[PDB]
Write an enzyme that holds these catalytic residues in place. Structure first.
Site, PDB file in Angstrom:
ATOM      1  N   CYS A 379     -54.020  28.383 -22.006  1.00 18.78           N
ATOM      2  CA  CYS A 379     -52.778  28.644 -22.729  1.00 18.78           C
ATOM      3  C   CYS A 379     -52.499  27.549 -23.752  1.00 18.78           C
ATOM      4  O   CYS A 379     -53.011  27.598 -24.875  1.00 18.78           O
ATOM      5  CB  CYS A 379     -51.608  28.784 -21.750  1.00 18.78           C
ATOM      6  N   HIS A 505     -54.280  32.886 -18.054  1.00 21.28           N
ATOM      7  CA  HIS A 505     -54.306  31.938 -16.944  1.00 21.28           C
ATOM      8  C   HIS A 505     -55.362  32.367 -15.936  1.00 21.28           C
ATOM      9  O   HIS A 505     -55.088  33.213 -15.070  1.00 21.28           O
ATOM     10  CB  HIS A 505     -52.930  31.847 -16.278  1.00 21.28           C
ATOM     11  N   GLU A 507     -56.551  30.715 -13.465  1.00 17.68           N
ATOM     12  CA  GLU A 507     -56.321  30.163 -12.138  1.00 17.68           C
ATOM     13  C   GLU A 507     -55.608  31.137 -11.211  1.00 17.68           C
ATOM     14  O   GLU A 507     -55.566  30.891 -10.001  1.00 17.68           O
ATOM     15  CB  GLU A 507     -55.521  28.862 -12.238  1.00 17.68           C
TER      16      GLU A 507
END
Ligand SMILES: Nc1ccn([C@@H]2O[C@H](COP(=O)(O)OP(=O)(O)OP(=O)(O)O)[C@@H](O)C2(F)F)c(=O)n1
Ligand SMILES: Nc1ccn([C@@H]2O[C@H](COP(=O)(O)OP(=O)(O)OP(=O)(O)O)[C@@H](O)C2(F)F)c(=O)n1
Ligand SMILES: Nc1ccn([C@@H]2O[C@H](COP(=O)(O)OP(=O)(O)OP(=O)(O)O)[C@@H](O)C2(F)F)c(=O)n1
Ligand SMILES: [Mg+2]
Ligand SMILES: [Mg+2]
Ligand SMILES: [Mg+2]
Lengths: 533, 533, 534
Positions: A379, A505, A507
């Site tokens: 990001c 994202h 993760e």
């Protein structure tokens, strides 16, 4: 096939790991072939964690449907394979917001809207909505038993146990059994008083999970069973561990899943924890070690990068590398320089918002590019990477984003409505999963091993397409685009061993059992950089 | 001159008369020259009682500024002369509505909005806002101590007592001391447990008001003082009485005002209850007796006409007449006829909404006009009176209101935007006080003894001005108009001993000490009708 | 077959009638052929109620084995036919005395004696001792839930339910549902707060008995079931009734016994309450009405003569006579005279201790003997009758009892070790329990009991002086009953009187509404005949 419910509460203190204990129990039940789901009931007045700061609450987890939820749902998706949605997390402010609107709209027919039954019915309907259709449903009640903020939740689940019946409901209560250095023993007194407090609300617990820095002996577990109307076999000991991946195995060895399947009358095979035994082995035996530095602005609370840190752990599991994450402040880079960047096998810049400490993230992306140090940006990590390349390679002086400098000459990052150019010429909040198209012969096309991939977004400012062609001619490569507008998703630098930056994202999709292709290659390239020293 | 606060709570049960006990105590303090005000904290989720039905909640009291509040504020204005406003009553839904909007607007700066301190601070700010500027402020906490719904209120006032200090705060707790026919004594055990419940929240009461059907003996008051850490002189006995006007005198005889003035360090003269002693004498010695029938639709709960019933009592005080109010269902008039209207010295039709039982109210206004029976109409009572005169005297067939029959030929009552005529030709929620102009040589001009008067409104449908001239030529008289649009307020029938109907609610300004000119003449005309039989 | 237990507790207030509600439930179970028993757990520190004044907790009930117990045991025997003993009533002081005794000996082996488990085990051992051997056992817990004094009892019974199991244990909790005149409704809030307090101790009630001055509607009973985790069918209403004999029928109509038998898995036939329906029929259909005056010294608390008052009402059932009992202070006879004894169809003088108000009882016994008013004396009522006949007939001035005047000339009532003469010559003690008594043939009590020997219960210390007895016999006094080896005088009679009987024992402890008592039946019948002649 009636749906069974397991209500999880906590006493004594709040830092007990209710979410991890619920996720671990759900991993055991899923290992027996059952359809399991988990939900989280938060007692704060915020309608959703979207308006909360990462410095106080932690990271804002994003589900597939695009809901901003508590980070405990990250634990849930990393222990079971059931997808989380908006129905798996709601707050007190969400409940009052629903009831207040129905009251102003006149949907209560001039009745007196009260905590009971109006507020409690709103809670019971959301639990049933996100629970029906499963075999076992774990409902985590936020807060500590005895506080004001959790009473509507506790009264609501008490009523569910009466209507659904004790044959399909269970109450699991987590307590703290502290160790005293004076007497050299653990104390069960806080547990005794907590159960009495839970009984004064109308809830008789069925399973007691005892949290402590060490195993709770059988003599203490027998005393707890005596004062709490609980059978001794239903008093489980959960000690402090160095790896939460061992918790499912610890709960199964004490027969917690057997007591639950017996109560709910479930005949399912034995829990096969072979995948978790493999993860414990991989973590306990690393063959190498690296030092990856995470340069951000919310580092004063490490829980702000919860899923990012856990994604680096999963990268080391697939490569058998011990990752030593080092939290470095991006503001110290602006003050002290790149001297705090020496001795790092890799560099990662996570997401964020606000201009505070961004110029340090731009300098960090520059230091990792000029010295051939592996770099991963998420990001905001892609924005500062695109700025560095445009500001130093493409020679776009003072290139920045409209979020930080609204009237800059080179707005390489801006909203879709704010897109302009260096002269002022124009053309004629994304949340959730979105398909992305990968460019062939790119570094991410090899790793993902697929043409199209799906990741989760949480951002507002995009890459300015009217300034992208001038950066591409400067050597920068575009690896991912999506949507009808062809928004830039992934950028790379081919004259570099590893330099990938993405807008989504990743993760939020990394698990310990299945890893993540992007973090696997990032940690792999970090060890190769350590070998060449 | 620091502002002192007296927090009033209740235990054991809910029907204790907390509002009456607070209003009576405020009447004593006002009798000593002090500036006193009262506020009510309701625990229901309704933003305001405007959306609540009179059948369940009771009447909706209206203040000068136009706020729809709980009926307890009617008790306040009938015991003290301080005007009530919006700042004197708020609910739990009002508090959560304030906090939810500030959170969505981002006024908490990304913080975690919690019950403490965010919800409690919102409560403390409203108490200080409506309390500052007075000598003594009485804060009535709705609900029963120990329930979930009142905990945010109780935690908030506990924090105020700490910051403001014990030198300017008091906790007054009302309990129930029931009498048992088995042992022939009153039981203090519910009081002992209630004080323990109030202490478990952090509040140590300072004054205990013991409610019972009989006086609490000194031996029982001494036992209560022993188990509750309260001095014996601070344990007040409040028995069941036949007239709430005696309660100020009962509290002063036990030195309740002296203990309060001593704690707050107030040096004020002795309470002069001469006005209340006069009201008790007037009520205890009536020279005549009448039977006034109230024909309505909410009669299944007499609290729906709380201020109306109390206004008829004040009419009998000024005329020394015992008024025996008879609740008659307007639907039974449609079923059984005007046979349930015989033997009435007067007839009153209060306000309301909905078509249910309106045709019976029209028939009742007709029976009182054809038989020269005194009639008083309020809001809906004026609509059914205007309908009867237009339908039976003006020969407007099937005249009705657009609220009931939207497409009627003669809409004598309609919204300002719905005004039409018998052919369809047109022209090119009022709450609070509004000035009204009275017509000379009218019955209300004599009673009010003033040109202009001020009353409180709560209605939507007005008198159709395009159909008024045809009714005026039929003999009907208009006595009151207001506003730039000259809306009809009061109507009369001159060929009648007493026939007045108004749009406003005069029962909201009637007090036992000063009466009300309209109800004084209505009850006076009711006794004169009884004499002529 | 396993013994089942039903623990009875009370909330909100204390005057709920836990003993009457427990006894009425046991009467239903006994009517279904079950072997049931009751026991009372008192929270006061007194070892036994013997050291308590009657104007404190009420009368001191006496069992067959000679145990001074709480008066709640009187309700038990009047409802079920199972005989109570010492192991049916114990107190907190009884528990601590036993634990302190074992600890001083060393039975705990140098261990730390604590409330848990040492005090709680002592409570559980006594409940099992008087409980095991029956089908259903009702354990009434004295005190109000939430107070300090009852907490050892509540923790002990909680541990029993865990060990025994919920298949043989039930928690029955009584609460108060007060009616408010300000709202015209009954309030369930005190019940809600009471159940939360009972839960905070670790007890989840199974049945809720709602006490109120009127029937509890279904809407209130449904709201109570909502907030208390109790099924709606297990919320029983128990209004105030004029006759406590109607309570077994009220609990049966609401299916309380059916819910209990279902939980305990007991297959027994339906209850037959014909014996209770008959008592109600007799009480509601009297043919005559009399006024019997009771002159005592504890009349400020009517429960001081609890079993005597109920015995007079049992006598009215067997004779279809509505008895109006008028409590009269014996001290008012000393000051205002016998003017307050006019209009009485009979006179009863109960027992007591202390010289205070005795001279008013001797004067009352004289009033009923001279004017031929039916008289019945019990214990002290026999002493003042023996004094009256010796002081005013046999002409022994200042004749009294050594309890009152130790150094008097004519001690007609004295301890056996104190027996003397009017000249000082001697001859060459707490009686408790049932003892056989032999009756005299041509006596009034011989035809009433219609048996040569009877069994009655004693609670007294001072006896009739045999050394001065024969001087009163020759004066015209008849001895109707003696007992023991020393031939202690038990019953005395005056022949020149319609009905004059006085006894040393307490016959009210054996009177029941279903069987009556021979002595009280004749006393009430004699009172009815006296009213007819006036
Ligand atoms: N509801 C209760 C429970 C206990 N105790 C009393 O608690 C006392 C024991 O106190 P401790 O040793 O400090 O607490 P522990 O129970 O052993 O549990 P841990 O030591 O792990 O904290 C008993 O005498 C008692 F008597 F048992 C009590 O009075 N009331
Ligand atoms: N915190 C307390 C308070 C009292 N008690 C015990 O309560 C017992 C007295 O019980 P009661 O007579 O039914 O109640 P009351 O106090 O007299 O008030 P009322 O009768 O008006 O309801 C004491 O033995 C006691 F022992 F005093 C207790 O154990 N713990
Ligand atoms: N555990 C509880 C129970 C109730 N209430 C709140 O109690 C309030 C109702 O108050 P009431 O009418 O005086 O009590 P009642 O239940 O109706 O029983 P009764 O009237 O027979 O005494 C609800 O708004 C509430 F909200 F339901 C609460 O806040 N927490
Ligand atoms: Mg210990
Ligand atoms: Mg008492
Ligand atoms: Mg209610």
């Amino acid at each position: 096939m009636t749906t069974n419910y397991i209500f999880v509460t906590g006493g004594v203190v709040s830092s007990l790991g209710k979410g991890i204990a619920a996720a671990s129990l759900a991993a055991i039940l899923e290992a027996r072939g059952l359809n399991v789901t988990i939900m989280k009931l938060d007692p704060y007045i915020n309608v959703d964690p979207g308006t909360m700061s990462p410095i106080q609450h932690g990271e804002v987890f994003v589900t597939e449907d695009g809901a901003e939820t508590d980070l405990d749902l990250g634990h849930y998706e990393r222990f079971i394979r059931t997808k989380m949605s908006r129905r798996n997390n709601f707050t007190t402010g969400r409940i009052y917001s629903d009831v207040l609107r129905k009251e102003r709209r006149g949907d209560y027919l001039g009745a007196t809207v009260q905590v009971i039954p109006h507020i409690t019915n709103a809670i019971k309907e959301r639990v049933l909505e996100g629970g029906e259709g499963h075999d076992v449903v774990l409902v985590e009640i936020g807060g500590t038993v005895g506080d004001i903020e959790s009473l509507p939740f506790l009264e609501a689940i008490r009523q569910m146990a009466v209507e659904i019946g004790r044959e399909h409901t269970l109450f699991m209560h987590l307590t703290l059994v502290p160790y005293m250095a004076a007497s050299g023993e653990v104390k069960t007194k806080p547990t005794q008083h907590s159960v009495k407090e839970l009984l004064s609300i109308g809830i008789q617990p069925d399973i007691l999970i005892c949290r402590s820095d060490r195993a709770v002996p059988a003599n203490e577990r027998a005393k707890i069973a005596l004062f709490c109307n609980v059978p001794e076999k239903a008093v489980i000991s959960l000690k402090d561990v160095d790896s939460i991946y061992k918790i499912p195995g610890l709960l199964k060895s004490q027969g917690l899943d057997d007591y639950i399947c017996k109560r709910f009358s479930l005949n399912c095979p034995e829990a096969n924890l072979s995948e978790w035994e493999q993860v414990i082995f991989e973590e306990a035996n690393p063959v190498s070690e690296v030092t990856i530095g995470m340069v951000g602005k919310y580092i004063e609370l490490p829980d702000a990068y919860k899923s990012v840190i856990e994604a680096l752990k999963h990268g080391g599991l697939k490569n058998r590398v011990s990752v030593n994450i080092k939290l470095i402040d991006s503001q110290d880079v602006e003050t002290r320089g790149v001297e705090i960047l020496k001795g790092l096998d890799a560099i990662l810049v996570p997401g964020g918002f606000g201009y505070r400490g961004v110029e340090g993230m731009i300098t960090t992306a520059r230091f990792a590019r000029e010295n051939n140090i592996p770099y991963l940006g998420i990001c905001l990590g892609m924005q500062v990477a695109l700025i560095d390349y445009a500001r130093h390679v493409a020679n776009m002086e003072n290139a920045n984003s409209t979020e930080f400098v609204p009237d800059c000459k080179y707005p390489v990052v801006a909203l879709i409505t704010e897109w302009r150019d260096e002269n002022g010429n124009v053309e004629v909040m994304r949340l959730g999963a979105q398909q992305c198209q990968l460019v062939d012969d790119s570094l991410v096309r090899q790793l993902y091993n697929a043409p199209t991939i799906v990741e989760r977004h949480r951002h507002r400012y995009e890459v300015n397409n009217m300034l992208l062609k001038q950066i591409e001619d400067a050597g920068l490569r575009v690896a991912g685009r999506s949507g009808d507008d062809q928004l830039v998703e992934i950028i790379e630098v081919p004259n570099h061993p590893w330099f990938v930056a993405c807008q989504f994202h990743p993760e939020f999709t990394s698990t310990p059992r299945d890893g993540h292709p992007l973090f696997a290659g990032f940690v792999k390239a970090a060890s190769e950089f350590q070998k060449r020293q």
